[PDB]
Symmetry: D2
Subunit: 392 residues, 4 copies
């Protein structure tokens, strides 16, 4: 009943494993009906876990779906080729011309760009809010607000929402709004979005659930209210993921507890050490006091993953930036995160100000986003330490 037991067993019914430990991998487009009667029975149950057509899924998808519903406490799981596909398509599934979308201004940039470049030309408007607005979100609601889009902690800058206050405020004014969250940082499990009255918990399963930086997949776990419309409207957009990726995602769940505990332990140690460092202005780790929304993190989360950022006292010029980033031995530059390896990315205040619509930034030094992987934490601190010496 504990999470580690859940993780090992999630989705592993005999009807999916067929004698093996893991689900089978059923590769298929065509699924064969042995009779008119069977074909008619499959048609009736085509969105209900019966083999009907590859686009709806095979045993391998059904297994992952069951596992996701168990882990996040959902009525259904809808699958997508990547996180960005789960975001764009989850929002598209619930809107119509004349609707309003209200989204945190700390939302992953492609999530915002979907709203500003795709939704806008379909007669759907979007506005943005500061992630710490809490109960004052009422001020940003419109008569036509259909979706309220959360991301906690926020992309890059890591602000944690006061979800209880936000949800209560939204329900008080537009109770029939669809509230969605990009719950990728928490891996859907360190923060139980659906227990908080959120309708749809979306993940880039690409990150922690896969955990190895070698498959892409999006998930949206839905409450009972929202599942049908998300599923059927995403189907009309031909959204699916391949059977092999679904397998590898279920397989990822198996080590997610041991991995997250290590990401938590190590990232917190790095963040504490950064907080005491002379060259560091501020540390944005949700688990750390003085970080935005930390108190909501403590109250509402059961853990931390390994992604965070910190602000240098300096704003690095281009040469110092190259000097710092080019010469790391264990941290690599790359996008994505949630793998076994450590990563490093720089953002300048001007870059971040440009992706914070209807809001202001709160720092002026160069911002570094770290993913703390599974390497030895002291080796990692040594690498960060050598970096500091390169920009003193």
């Amino acid at each position: 009943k504990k999470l580690d037991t859940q993780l090992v067993n999630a989705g592993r019914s005999k009807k999916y494993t067929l004698g093996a430990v893991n689900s089978v991998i059923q590769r298929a487009s065509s699924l064969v009906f042995d009779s008119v009667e069977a074909k008619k029975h499959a048609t009736r149950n085509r969105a209900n876990g019966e083999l009907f057509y590859g686009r709806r899924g095979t045993l391998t998808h059904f297994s992952l779906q069951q596992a996701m519903c168990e882990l996040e406490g959902g009525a259904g799981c809808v699958l997508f080729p990547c996180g960005a596909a789960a975001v764009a398509n989850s929002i598209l599934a619930f809107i119509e011309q004349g609707d309003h979308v209200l989204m945190t201004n700390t939302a992953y940039e492609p999530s915002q760009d979907f709203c500003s470049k795709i939704l806008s030309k379909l007669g759907v408007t979007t506005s943005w809010f500061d992630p710490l607005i809490g109960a004052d979100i009422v001020k940003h609601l419109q008569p036509n607000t259909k979706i309220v889009f959360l991301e906690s902690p926020g992309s890059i800058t890591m602000e944690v929402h006061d979800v209880p206050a936000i949800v209560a405020a939204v329900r008080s004014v537009v109770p029939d709004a669809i509230i969605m969250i990009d719950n990728t940082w928490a891996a859907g499990v360190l923060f139980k979005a659906l227990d908080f009255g959120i309708d749809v918990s979306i993940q880039a399963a690409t990150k922690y659930l896969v955990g190895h930086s070698d498959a892409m997949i999006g998930t949206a776990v839905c409450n009972a209210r929202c599942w049908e419309q998300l599923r059927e409207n995403a189907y009309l957009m031909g959204q699916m993921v391949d059977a092999d990726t679904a397998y590898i995602t279920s397989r990822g769940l198996r080590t997610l507890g041991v991995r997250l505990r290590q990401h938590h332990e190590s990232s917190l140690k790095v963040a504490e050490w950064l907080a005491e460092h002379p060259q560091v202005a501020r540390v944005n780790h949700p688990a750390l006091p003085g970080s935005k929304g930390h108190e909501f993190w403590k109250r509402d989360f059961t853990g931390s993953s390994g992604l965070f950022s910190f602000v240098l006292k300096k704003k690095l010029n281009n040469e110092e930036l190259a000097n710092y980033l080019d010469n790391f031995s264990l941290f690599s530059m790359a996008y994505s995160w949630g793998g076994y390896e450590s990563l490093i990315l720089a953002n300048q205040p001007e870059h971040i100000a440009a992706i914070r619509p209807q809001g202001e930034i709160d720092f002026s030094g160069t911002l570094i986003r770290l993913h703390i992987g599974l390497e030895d934490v002291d080796d990692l601190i040594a690498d960060l330490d050598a970096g500091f010496a390169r920009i003193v």
Copy 2:
């Protein structure tokens, strides 16, 4: 320079094969930048075949993309999780509220349903045309017509468009329309859509390109005019396909010539034999005289694949339908087609009338859709022959 040589070699540059015969399989979300300078160079070339992020693709995607552009004569290839995803997302990529979509009424049903259920609520209207309308398509154009959507031969009923006449008519009235085709029957190669002044040739690569009924993938090969907008707008919807599927698709190309010649030879023999059969009212095979648009097929296509249909003299009742379909030895019931195996599906006139908007059907008997696979053609004819005896 012949198609078989093209097929063997398409996409197989050394930069993708790295010493092997086939492209490597590069599984990745994160792609690592070795320096700020490399990261900046990759950013600039991120839609241009340089490794940048898994969502844009890896070497394995780039190889398939190159192969598709070569085979269809396109400026670019955009990839999707399945055919239906390539259809919905190709159309979405070019529309805005207030636009009109004009689509053949013989379009695959999910293609129509995307228009009628998704587009309509985004302020985009759709109307339909008879596939043999040819130059008289002018009658259906509106000031706001943005897309004209073709499918030749048509789904199920197999009508071939007079593409030259349709294209010329559209260009005469709305020269800036986006003309698209679902070119899956031809596998993009028996009909060179882009040579015919079509802007986007879309395939369910799931069918012939894969050829084994075990992977799903959509492709849209674009002319230079349309590539950017399709690619960038599909990216904003997070559309991609996994590296393994891309590999398997490139691998499918290798035997597409030998497979199609066999599908052509065998299906034509079956269709000729059906045409002489007493229990058969009509045969809808594009390669066969008396079939709708056959003369356009002869003029414009370089071959036939293995999908066609025929109309029984009877309209089967439920019991005769079960008797017929339940008792085949080599034909199986399933959706999809374009694999190595033979398939059979029944449709009643009432079913087809319901998916032919703004048009009338032309038959009254039960319609049978056959996919002729790679089995021995005489074994296949024996199975069909036993079926006839079951419903005499």
Copy 3:
């Protein structure tokens, strides 16, 4: 009916489970729901009940059923590559003091396994000319345990008179196990077990896979030999992974349309080469006049796309490079049986060193071709340009 058999081979509902292709069951551990169930699996662990991944999953059982129906056998043993199937099939039947009799035209690693591994185990090997037929009795010892055939032969492509050899072997050493490396025929163009051969071995790597990207060996056995090969191979830990098994089953599906094209194209090239002024001889089983062509015509139901020819000259190293480095369509590589065309050269000296107890009978450079699925006239054009480089 071969095309129909190929499409359906191994595709029982218990293996495909609603799909067209067999499922892919990746597993080491296989779970027993009860102690009874574990007893039942144990008693059936070599008889297609799930027991342990080393013995196989549904995916392996599917491929094994398919190979057995295609080659008309009692069982199909699986190996990580063709060379593993050859080495381990032979090992499974010998003991110290045995003798092995192998065609001198056998694939070199097959010969090497005998000369370098068996020899230190007290097993002797000697060799025969592939055209020996009934005169093979000459070479049969009272301790001859294995007679190992390869028809057509590696590189030089000589075809055995299998019926004559089998009759001779049975009359003198009935206890011998007769084996064939039947890869060139993809197991289906020559129905080895119907000719009285005990074990038909394939580098499934070749035409069965058909795409040059999976490695696997198979050994289809009659009922006389299946258990021994199966159990002794198992003691050596021989198996192949589930996904490779899947891909090999998948290969079968296009095997007919592929082999027909390899046949038609290779023979056209062969016929053109035979008439070429720069060509001494062509070694193609399907071509009239080739060594053993009479046996090919009688005993085979088709041809594949691998053959060789002898240049009138023996190329020197500069010529060799000018010829081979400058092809546009043919690539240099080992293996064959994929969709693409390949070229390799062997000098007569090289061949002389791998024909034990034999004598080479050509003096020009030998060129081995695999004719793939490219347009045949494009391929002839590429060879024509190669001839210009060496005139």
Copy 4:
């Protein structure tokens, strides 16, 4: 630094090519752009230049580099499963007239390979008690070619005094090859090559893969033995597929966080069982009092999650079924080293039949547990309920 090494092992840019993980290069044929290039690859075909798929691709070279750095070896030979690596590693070093000396606690198929395959090849095998240490000189013959260790032992979990055994072997038969099945330690909890062992073998199937869905064997060799094992294994056609190589490399990445959890959980279960009224003895290398625990504590840097214990009673078949059929979390299956927990029973008679030249010293039913990644208290609760079924 093991966690850092695990994360990075084998991940050179030449293998990953811009990605985080190595590429997957599926290939049999590998193309030579020129005759020169083909010469160069040929001379380097065992030295990590692309030559033929049977020798490996980039993906195999990546895993081989990783195993070599993790176990401190000159080379890493790959096999389709652990049992293949054991059978073939031994074969690679013997000849007729040799003697093999193997722990009587060796995995049964390891013993069977010796008694059923080697014996008919003129190779003799005898066996020793795992706690023999320096007294192993007793068993060493002038023709002893292989000394084969397994520490901890299969099933009963006895830990060798490796330093004492190695010193004795070197003093008496310096030409002997000392081998270990080092799977329980995942190669990294016991640095076998640093103790003077020649070849460290793993069923990589176990902890390296870590998920019970890929099969593979590895044999990491010192410089003295690498070439022979490598070349002789190759003559047997031993290899593993590229995708399994990829997945094994991938396993390494979580190996540290996994092993630490298997250690912590298994030891807690062991400690609880040792104190249980229904339990006679617990066989866990990490538990004080277990056979060879002093050697585990001295020579190992950690523990994995596989161990066993002896019930006070010998269960009859009804009791066996009531105990084993009714678990909620532990499953019955062979293999171990995955994320899930497993249980198997062995009766003392069963064990007595696989301890050649040894004597069993327990009389109750022996229960082998693999402790996976589930919550340890859930697992203890499941065992507690099992005890209630048999009181």
